[PDB]
């Protein structure tokens, strides 16, 4: 519903779950996508901590 400001951002912890970003294709329409330190195509075959 609402977001935060620049001077006071937010932090959330996500753990113990399976990574599947394919549900964003039907609704989400992004405008920027850049990755550092990992290949975008290899994200399905790795783990994140």
């Amino acid at each position: 519903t609402r977001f935060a400001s620049v001077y006071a951002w937010n932090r959330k912890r996500i753990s113990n779950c399976v990574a599947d970003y394919s549900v964003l294709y039907n609704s989400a329409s992004f405008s920027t996508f850049k990755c550092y330190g990992v290949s975008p195509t290899k994200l399905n075959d790795l783990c994140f901590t």
């Binding site: 405008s31 996508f33 850049k34 990755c35 290949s39 975008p40």
Partner: protein, 49 residues
Amino acid sequence: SKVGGNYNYLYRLFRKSNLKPFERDISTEIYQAGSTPCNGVEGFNCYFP
């Protein structure tokens, strides 16, 4: 060093894979970071290395 910045120095930023010691890569082309083909034209998700 000169007024307005010297813009004759260029470096690579994006590549699909890693290099090898003592190897040169002068192939300049547009790169796709997503699943939609770039179609040879810079635009969304298409950034020049």
